[PDB]
Ligand binder design. Structure first.
Ligand SMILES: NC(=O)c1ccc[n+]([C@@H]2O[C@H](COP(=O)([O-])OP(=O)(O)OC[C@H]3O[C@@H](n4cnc5c(N)ncnc54)[C@H](O)[C@@H]3O)[C@@H](O)[C@H]2O)c1
Ligand SMILES: NC(=O)c1ccc[n+]([C@@H]2O[C@H](COP(=O)([O-])OP(=O)(O)OC[C@H]3O[C@@H](n4cnc5c(N)ncnc54)[C@H](O)[C@@H]3O)[C@@H](O)[C@H]2O)c1
Ligand SMILES: OC[C@H]1O[C@H](O[C@H]2O[C@H](CO)[C@@H](O)[C@H](O)[C@H]2O)[C@H](O)[C@@H](O)[C@@H]1O
Ligand SMILES: OC[C@H]1O[C@H](O[C@H]2O[C@H](CO)[C@@H](O)[C@H](O)[C@H]2O)[C@H](O)[C@@H](O)[C@@H]1O
Ligand SMILES: OC[C@H]1O[C@H](O[C@H]2O[C@H](CO)[C@@H](O)[C@H](O)[C@H]2O)[C@H](O)[C@@H](O)[C@@H]1O
Ligand SMILES: OC[C@H]1O[C@H](O[C@H]2O[C@H](CO)[C@@H](O)[C@H](O)[C@H]2O)[C@H](O)[C@@H](O)[C@@H]1O
Ligand SMILES: OC[C@H]1O[C@H](O[C@H]2O[C@H](CO)[C@@H](O)[C@H](O)[C@H]2O)[C@H](O)[C@@H](O)[C@@H]1O
Ligand SMILES: OC[C@H]1O[C@H](O[C@H]2O[C@H](CO)[C@@H](O)[C@H](O)[C@H]2O)[C@H](O)[C@@H](O)[C@@H]1O
Ligand SMILES: OC[C@H]1O[C@H](O[C@H]2O[C@H](CO)[C@@H](O)[C@H](O)[C@H]2O)[C@H](O)[C@@H](O)[C@@H]1O
Ligand SMILES: OC[C@H]1O[C@H](O[C@H]2O[C@H](CO)[C@@H](O)[C@H](O)[C@H]2O)[C@H](O)[C@@H](O)[C@@H]1O
Ligand SMILES: OC[C@H]1O[C@H](O[C@H]2O[C@H](CO)[C@@H](O)[C@H](O)[C@H]2O)[C@H](O)[C@@H](O)[C@@H]1O
Ligand SMILES: OC[C@H]1O[C@H](O[C@H]2O[C@H](CO)[C@@H](O)[C@H](O)[C@H]2O)[C@H](O)[C@@H](O)[C@@H]1O
Ligand SMILES: OC[C@H]1O[C@H](O[C@H]2O[C@H](CO)[C@@H](O)[C@H](O)[C@H]2O)[C@H](O)[C@@H](O)[C@@H]1O
Ligand SMILES: OC[C@H]1O[C@H](O[C@H]2O[C@H](CO)[C@@H](O)[C@H](O)[C@H]2O)[C@H](O)[C@@H](O)[C@@H]1O
Lengths: 451, 451
């Protein structure tokens, strides 16, 4: 007796996800690009097709139990939020949302409406993260105070300028439903499909593409919540496009200790774009820190624990392979079909799936927080974050922010010229508020925060 | 009595340097590009002009006392080396050489021939580095075990492909004398004037352009020598062009202690291309780490000492202005005219200038060693360096190296493609030997290492 699922954003990842769900009932499909997406729609010949989720939701929500969402980052929130208010379970690809306010909105709506929820970081349903947690929690490495994490991404070009040409909107593409709540701009294929990753207003760069896969063991294993301090630096930082390489450093406060391991204040370093943490003491020359596209090094007082992306293949530098007590549930079905199971339990008995918004909500808040760190970098200050009120506490009321628009380097009869164009300065406090909570384009509205 | 000076590489920096020496006698000028450099030649209308340093040296060495060198990096060594074997003092812009072997060659030749020498890092003759040394040496910050250094450079584009079109050699440009001992290639104006910085075979990137200015306080003040370990990582690493941004980590061994401060094993971090060290504890929010294009943070057991590029404006995080005994020679003449003075002293009474190759020789070896770190990065290992024999000790003979030639990312009706083209693998041990000591193109010969 099957879940009725609507899909929204089916052309890319959404394709393989709907594959997971096929046992069920795909009854409605909604993509904005009927060309990129065609292959999928006619894999599900029985599903009424749409190209604006709001027409689909009007007609078809009354016939649906769940909603899968694999759109570009900046619309996940508003789609998911409209579905939960309607009583509907939602799978939502990672990253969960584009902003911090949105992540917190979703966490609070999941709670309020009592609906199965799942972020699309599927390495949360794998074995490797269960072994990292069961080991740290049995004190196998001791107290953890410094963590280093990295990806090799971006592997596409970032550092892009807004295209200066024109291009007409294809007949197959609903360019307005794509912009959604973001600020409107002239269409170009540099923005979709796929390449939205490197654009501030749509994607979250390497952070959004890879950090939810890489940092999930660090967040669950150290039972992290809100950080207290964050700082970032990067290669040339532009106003519309993410940079080629960034370093971010977070600091989290001490948490309750556990019986076999203490949970002190921990510093979490993130590197990407080629940049790597320096090699741990004890690690063999020649062992690659990258496994499946990234690495984590937990520096512990008694030993050093290393894993790959998706938490794969954890090992201790010393050579010891612990045999710690089993504590986390072993997920037997897939990452998607576990979410399905959760949808069919009554709210009162429901065993949440591995990426329920209760965990992934706050987790995404840390990933997306790294964006704020990198863009506010010119403030030249550890940024102090108050988590419960979603604001920095330590930005002066008269400091300002300016980004580079375009680099103008050129040589001129041998002598060089370092021209550059910069945006108009805005108030740093308002800049920041707006990265944390976006002002939605007219005709686009989130549901209210509860509580 | 006046110094007879030849100049070699006069168009760019060489211009302002010849300005310093004007009090003397500029009798010979040799540039390869008679167009870029015309302005200079006719500032010194009496100087026999050449475009190949070896013709000039034949005709005019027997008439010269000294030789100024401000060519592109990769020829400094061979020019300087031929001058010193002839009994001639040399000023040589920074970086001193392109390779480590060359730096060691020059240090040993200065010693053997007893000639005044000066590297062109003029911040060595300035005040701020005397204050950093007099303070460290008087225990004002205590023992230093961790140093962080950075520049905002490169401020020009690197990450370049060999140009695919052709241009003809102007009549004004002796493109062969330019290549010198480097491997020959078709001419293009992407290679000179000025822009050679971004090309492995000619320049050393941001390292060569800024690190001798930034790291000179760290080397002199901690009385460093050979490091024992290095490692590096970077953005996209190409086979002919330096990258957008790099991080290097050096480790030096403990040195003799001084009366008032101990000299333990110290780690030196280097960042560039926008990447910055995390902010020190104690430092005011808002205060910029960059001063005159870079920053140095000496982390001490009792206090934190910060300076800018060229060692400018050293301050302690605490707020104290120490008042340490004066120890280093206070340079009253200019950076160039001090070297001149040194040339006119008899060898046995010569007070060396502030950048005599006895110091700058080893100093450059560390700067240029950061290149080796970045290019050997794929070996996935802390590299152990044996200084006295100029080789790594921990590169396997089985292992090989491959660089990216050009990135082929493109999207194609929405579906993306991650092509990249790679060089043919070469033996890693021989690759490295050759970066340390280049094999000179036939017809180009360094002097022997002295016995
Ligand atoms: N879990 C993983 O392994 C994983 C892998 C890849 C992508 N993702 C995530 O999944 C999401 C999709 O990325 P992708 O590479 O598949 O993108 P894509 O652009 O390749 O495909 C997304 C599809 O959504 C459609 N779409 C976009 N905006 C829409 C909107 N507003 N309304 C309706 N349809 C819309 C697009 O036209 C396209 O067909 C992102 O959040 C991404 O980071 C997760
Ligand atoms: N001390 C500093 O502040 C500083 C400043 C600028 C440059 N530099 C250094 O000085 C050097 C030159 O830099 P630049 O910006 O003047 O370069 P440039 O390319 O602008 O000028 C170099 C000049 O030398 C000529 N030349 C090049 N190769 C030659 C060769 N083999 N023989 C003879 N002439 C040759 C060139 O045509 C040009 O006339 C580099 O080593 C660079 O790092 C140091
Ligand atoms: O009227 C309450 C809700 O009814 C539907 O959902 C219920 O039944 C679904 C079928 O199993 C379950 O998936 C769901 O958990 C139940 O609450 C509908 O999904 C909701 O939108 C209504 O709010
Ligand atoms: O997280 C705790 C500390 O971890 C590091 O140090 C521990 O582990 C090292 C090897 O991984 C050992 O050198 C050392 O003995 C341990 O203390 C790190 O050195 C510290 O900065 C962390 O606080
Ligand atoms: O960087 C873009 C994507 O990288 C990862 O995806 C690739 O690697 C996975 C591991 O083999 C494959 O399953 C996947 O099919 C590949 O494209 C990452 O998992 C994605 O989320 C990124 O978008
Ligand atoms: O925490 C201070 C230590 O710094 C070095 O090592 C720590 O951090 C390194 C990463 O840059 C790791 O390689 C190392 O395992 C960490 O403990 C250094 O090894 C030590 O002298 C310091 O204790
Ligand atoms: O990401 C949202 C927008 O960010 C940039 O714009 C802000 O920053 C400018 C100065 O750095 C201000 O002039 C402007 O008011 C801000 O909105 C970017 O330039 C925009 O295009 C983005 O949409
Ligand atoms: O792209 C739409 C608007 O963006 C900027 O404004 C947003 O963010 C501001 C802070 O930088 C807020 O003051 C404002 O509420 C937001 O709309 C820009 O300043 C506006 O001029 C644009 O319309
Ligand atoms: O005739 C012997 C040397 O002649 C030159 O050197 C002398 O004259 C110069 C005047 O200051 C100085 O370079 C040098 O210190 C003197 O030795 C020539 O430079 C050398 O090659 C000869 O040994
Ligand atoms: O140079 C050796 C150590 O330097 C630092 O330690 C001192 O400086 C810190 C602030 O810059 C102090 O807070 C710290 O407590 C001092 O001991 C550095 O923090 C250490 O990592 C180095 O071992
Ligand atoms: O990276 C460009 C160059 O930066 C420095 O030089 C600039 O700034 C100096 C003082 O700020 C001036 O003397 C000089 O005229 C400027 O070009 C640095 O000295 C150079 O080596 C760099 O190449
Ligand atoms: O050395 C272990 C310390 O880790 C941090 O230490 C360094 O980095 C800080 C910020 O990036 C600096 O302020 C500090 O001076 C460095 O030692 C941190 O200071 C502490 O939690 C640890 O002692
Ligand atoms: O000095 C740099 C030169 O080396 C690079 O190529 C070397 O390494 C290649 C693989 O990365 C080998 O195939 C080759 O034998 C080596 O010379 C670079 O590719 C060249 O541009 C430079 O001449
Ligand atoms: O264009 C550069 C010339 O040298 C290259 O070879 C050097 O590096 C090799 C290892 O990568 C050494 O084995 C070799 O002896 C060196 O000369 C290149 O392989 C040659 O084709 C070029 O002539």
């Amino acid at each position: 007796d099957k879940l009725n699922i609507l899909g929204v954003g089916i052309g890319g990842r959404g394709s393989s996800v709907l594959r997971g769900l096929e046992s069920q009932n795909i009854i409605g499909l909604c993509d904005v690009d009927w060309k990129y997406a065609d292959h999928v729609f006619k894999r599900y010949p029985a599903a009424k097709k749409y190209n604006d989720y709001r027409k689909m939701f009007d007609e078809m929500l009354k016939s649906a139990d769940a909603v899968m969402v694999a759109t570009a980052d900046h619309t996940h929130a508003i789609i998911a939020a409209d579905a939960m208010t309607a009583g509907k379970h939602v799978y939502v690809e990672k990253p969960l949302t584009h902003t911090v306010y949105e992540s917190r909105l979703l966490t609070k709506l999941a709670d309020k409406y009592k609906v199965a929820t799942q972020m699309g970081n599927q390495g949360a349903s794998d074995e490797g993260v269960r072994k990292v947690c069961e080991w740290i929690w049995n004190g196998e490495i001791g107290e953890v105070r410094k963590v280093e994490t990295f990806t090799d991404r971006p592997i596409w070009p970032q550092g892009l300028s807004r295209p200066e040409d024109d291009q007409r909107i294809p007949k197959t593409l609903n360019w307005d439903a794509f912009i959604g709540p973001a600020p409107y701009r002239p269409y170009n294929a540099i923005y979709t499909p796929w390449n939205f990753r490197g654009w501030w207003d749509f994607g979250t760069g390497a952070l959004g593409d890879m950090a939810c896969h890489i940092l999930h063991p660090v967040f669950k294993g150290l039972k992290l919540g809100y950080p207290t301090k964050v700082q970032g630096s990067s290669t040339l930082l532009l106003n519309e496009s993410a940079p080629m390489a960034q370093t971010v450093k977070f600091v989290f406060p001490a948490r309750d200790n556990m019986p076999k391991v203490a949970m002190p204040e921990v510093e979490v370093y993130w590197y990407d774009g080629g940049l790597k943490p320096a090699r741990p003491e004890g690690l063999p020359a020649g062992k690659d820190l990258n496994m499946a596209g990234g690495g984590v090094i937990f520096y512990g007082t008694k030993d050093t624990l290393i894993c790959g992306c998706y938490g794969v293949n954890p090992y201790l530098v010393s050579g010891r392979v612990p045999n710690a007590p089993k504590v986390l549930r072993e997920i037997k079905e897939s990452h998607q079909m576990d979410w399905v199971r959760a949808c069919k339990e009554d709210a009162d008995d429901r065993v949440p799936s591995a990426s329920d918004f209760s965990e992934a909500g706050p987790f995404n808040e840390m990933v997306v927080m790294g964006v704020l760190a990198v863009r506010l970098q010119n403030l030249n200050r550890e940024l102090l974050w108050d988590g419960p009120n979603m604001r920095f506490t330590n930005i002066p009321d008269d400091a300002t922010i300016s980004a580079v628009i375009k680099d103008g380097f050129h040589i001129k009869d041998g002598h060089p010229t370092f021209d550059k164009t910069w945006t108009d300065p805005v108030n740093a406090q308002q800049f920041a508020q707006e990265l944390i909570k976006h002002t939605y384009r007219d005709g686009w509205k989130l549901p209210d925060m509860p509580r």
